[PDB]
Design a protein around this ligand. Structure first.
Ligand SMILES: [Ca+2]
Ligand SMILES: [Ca+2]
Ligand SMILES: [Ca+2]
Ligand SMILES: [Cl-]
Ligand SMILES: [Cl-]
Ligand SMILES: [Cl-]
Ligand SMILES: [Cl-]
Lengths: 243, 243
């Protein structure tokens, strides 16, 4: 789908002692750009970026009624403090609350989960593993360019779910908005299976164009997680997509 | 419904050599707050804050198909340069493009416009004047507290239009988003009939509450337009609603 490699983006990885790939897609021009054509097509566990298709399926099936429905904390104190409270869809996305989404997956069930991922053509369409963790330590794999293809369908309401489900998930993906741009996006952190990597996928809305992006990077410890957004935003600024 | 006057907010107006009102509504507690109970109930022309009901009606009637439909420039060079180009619903809201919305109102028509504003309980529901300018120089009036009453219905999808129309307009109202809050809002600047006033109405979404707001202020010249948001934010910061 015509692709250009820009190795100069590696400066932002090197200056932060990191390795990874950033993939950009110019929607108006139907042109992609990446610092690493090979890693752009390498498929990894999605980790919490799977909250995007999981939210879509839970909404379309009515497992989740709307973005205000409250999911009560199950009482177990977990390591991440923001998880130990009640949540709705907006806040569960914001704080990447895995237990809420594992509950969704159990209710969806393997049969409907598999049919939906085949309908979405999501990654390798493989949900081998535990129904409540296959996106963390099971068989599903998705590349950065495959994230882009999925996200473009979601942006255009072209996925095989209701228009309403897609609108709600795109609301819950809202990450940043100002007078220059809007970012809708989701992070992920894959630690259970090598290689440990961090994800950021989503898009930048401008007045007259949309730039889709998907990045992943090596993440040996959780102390580099903020580099997912930092390095992406530095690539977007280098390309004059955002000020 | 339990109102409290806080005259210490007047300092933010006087600091800026200005006069006006800010009205806040705590949705969880169902309590309102204002620096001026009398001006909070004073009805003014809505000017471009009327883009919120106008968008809702145009979408519900199919005058606007979706937020991507392009409204071509009519080739009239107007004083605000950002108006002299093609727009969609998102950019027409962002740049407050009056002529796009005047065309909406002509296509809606007098009969359907009057019926819909009655259905919304919007202000005084009076559309006396030109069908394509009554919110700028006709008979419609709305107070800051009435703006909040209307906005609360929109937030809850309770207005008598489709859920889809309400979701699209709330998307188009997106003004600011970060890791702490989301602001959905619309500015207005009424100059055709005295007194000249500026508006800012909308809400702040937090993790666990929603704060609705409506402000207007005297605006003799366009030089103070930035004070509409700046003074509201100074009040929100004083009240610890935003960091
Ligand atoms: Ca850099
Ligand atoms: Ca496939
Ligand atoms: Ca102040
Ligand atoms: Cl998850
Ligand atoms: Cl207007
Ligand atoms: Cl009501
Ligand atoms: Cl939104």
């Amino acid at each position: 789908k015509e692709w250009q490699e820009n190795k100069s983006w590696n400066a932002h990885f090197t200056e932060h002692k990191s390795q990874g790939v950033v993939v950009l897609w110019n929607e108006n021009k139907q042109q992609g750009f990446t610092n690493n054509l090979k890693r752009a097509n390498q498929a990894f566990l999605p980790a919490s970026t799977f909250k995007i298709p999981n939210s879509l399926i839970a909404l379309d099936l009515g497992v989740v009624k709307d973005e205000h429905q409250v999911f009560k904390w199950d009482g177990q104190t977990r390591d991440i403090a923001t998880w130990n409270r009640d949540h709705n869809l907006i806040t569960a996305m914001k704080y990447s609350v895995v237990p809420v989404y594992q509950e969704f997956a159990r209710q969806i069930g393997e049969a409907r989960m598999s049919k939906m991922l085949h309908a979405f053509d999501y990654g390798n369409e493989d949900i081998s593993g535990n129904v409540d963790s296959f996106w963390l330590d099971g068989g599903i794999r998705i590349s950065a360019t495959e994230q882009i293809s999925f996200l473009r369908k979601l942006y255009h309401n072209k996925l095989h779910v209701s228009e309403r489900s897609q609108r709600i998930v795109k609301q819950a993906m809202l990450t940043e908005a100002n007078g220059d741009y809007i970012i809708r996006a989701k992070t992920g952190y894959s630690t259970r299976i090598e290689p440990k990597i961090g994800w950021w996928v989503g898009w930048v809305e401008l007045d007259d164009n949309v730039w889709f992006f998907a990045m992943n990077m090596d993440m040996p410890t959780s102390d580099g997680l903020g580099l997912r957004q930092a390095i992406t935003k530095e690539v977007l600024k280098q390309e004059k997509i955002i000020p």
